[PDB]
Amino acid sequence: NLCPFGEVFNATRFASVYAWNRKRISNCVADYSVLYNSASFSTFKCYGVSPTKLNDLCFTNVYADSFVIRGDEVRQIAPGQTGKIADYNYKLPDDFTGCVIAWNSNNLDSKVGGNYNYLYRLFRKSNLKPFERDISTEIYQAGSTPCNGVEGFNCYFPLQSYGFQPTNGVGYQPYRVVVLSFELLHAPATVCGPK
Amino acid sequence: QVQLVESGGGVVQPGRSLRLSCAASGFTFSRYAMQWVRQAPGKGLEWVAVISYDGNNRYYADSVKGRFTISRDNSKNTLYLQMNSLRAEDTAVYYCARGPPGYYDSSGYYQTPEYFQHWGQGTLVTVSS
Amino acid sequence: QSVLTQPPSVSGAPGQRVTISCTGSSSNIGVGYDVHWYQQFPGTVPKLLIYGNSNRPSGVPDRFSGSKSGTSASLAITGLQAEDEADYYCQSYDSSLSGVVFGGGTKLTVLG
């Protein structure tokens, strides 16, 4: 009956931002008390509702997205900003309601010497609307040219890896970020509160 | 795209009350915390006041504490300023600004926005006798 | 608690890497609160430049890259050109009975 958020947070594997994973979690009881009582969560953003009230104000439907990005822009993932990740990899809607959680996991993902196993879209044809996991891998172009699918003058791979190394600094350390998006409909609910 | 424009500025004698404002467009204005910031010419621009997304939470700088009134109508989709006990040094340009919405924090306490994304065009206040 | 200390102005050859620092108090920056830097041209609207300690919003093409330390912050203009000539403000929250603090103001200066 319990909502497997702790699954997502304590999940062994996380995806890259461009391939940000989505969970249509529902029909379970939520324990956000477990969430905001975490000592782990260095950052805890919430927009549209106090993390206090979620425990006892309950929703039609919820989405739990997750991905991995370098630490400092954790607040790029916010309601209505422009920027690298906001524009081309993940954009919350201006009228977004939900929360943003993250934490450092150098012990998990940082590897001595070299790691490059997380990706983010480097540049795209047009801005990304809210909520589209656009797994698009064809070589982006920026002009009048036959891309020919081959790198060169202008047409470039749209995705770029990371450099998560333990010997690097806190702003650049890999933070695993979970986005709790919320949605209400002209429909019955699926998640609610205790005692 | 979002557009913010100020209005109501002018030359005012020190001491009397005044009403500034700023109209909003291009974004869900009702659910963003807004800010008013000061810039004396040639001097560093400084924060004046910040209004919660719902207008419930308000914060003024110390130098402007009490003398100033912030207000805003979600339905009207705009932001207002009420001026009491003006002073000459406050002759400056005033900017209405939008940043990321004020996130509620863990354990429930509100937090004001930490930075400003877009700005109004600006209004002038000349607190001069 | 204090105003974020800034240099008055700095200079650099066009297109080379230069830096601006910004220092704060324990209750100012080292408490954990982050910085952001704005620019504005003389007598113009202020525009945000780098809000994440090292992230760029759109229209901030490149050459702008922030940082973080224990108690100091820095932007590198890795390549400057007269379009960058403005004054730049380092803004960070304060936990000293205050809200957001704004830098004194630093002028970039290209060689004549």
Numbering used by the authors:
A (entry chain A): 334 to 528
B (entry chain H): 1 to 129
C (entry chain L): 1 to 112
Paper lines:
Neutralizing antibodies that recognize the SARS-CoV-2 spike glycoprotein are the principal host defense against viral invasion. That is, immune escape and receptor binding exert competing selective pressures on the evolution of the SARS-CoV-2 spike protein, which is both the viral receptor-binding and fusion protein and the sole known target of protective antibodies (Abs). The ACE2 binding surface (“RBD-2”) harbored the binding sites of the neutralizing antibodies with highest potency but with the greatest sensitivity to viral escape; two other epitopic regions on the RBD (“RBD-1 and “RBD-3”) bound antibodies of more modest potency but greater breadth.
G32Q4, in the RBD-3 cluster, bound the face of the RBD that contacts an adjacent RBD in the “down” conformation; it competed with CR3022, an antibody originally isolated from a convalescent SARS-CoV infected donor. For G32Q4 to bind, both the targeted RBD and the adjacent RBD need to be in the “up” configuration. The observed footprint of antibody G32Q4 avoided any of the Omicron BA.1 variant mutations. The equilibrium dissociation constants for the C98C7 and G32Q4 Fabs (22 and 1.8 μM, respectively) were consistent with the diminished, but measurable neutralizing potencies of the corresponding mAbs. G32A4 and C98C7 belong to well-studied public classes, which dominate the RBD-2-cluster; G32Q4 showed a convergence of structure and recognition with a published antibody encoded by completely different VH and VL gene segments. No repeatedly found mutations lie within the footprints of the more “idiosyncratic” G32R7 and G32Q4, in the RBD-1 and RBD-3 competition groups, respectively.
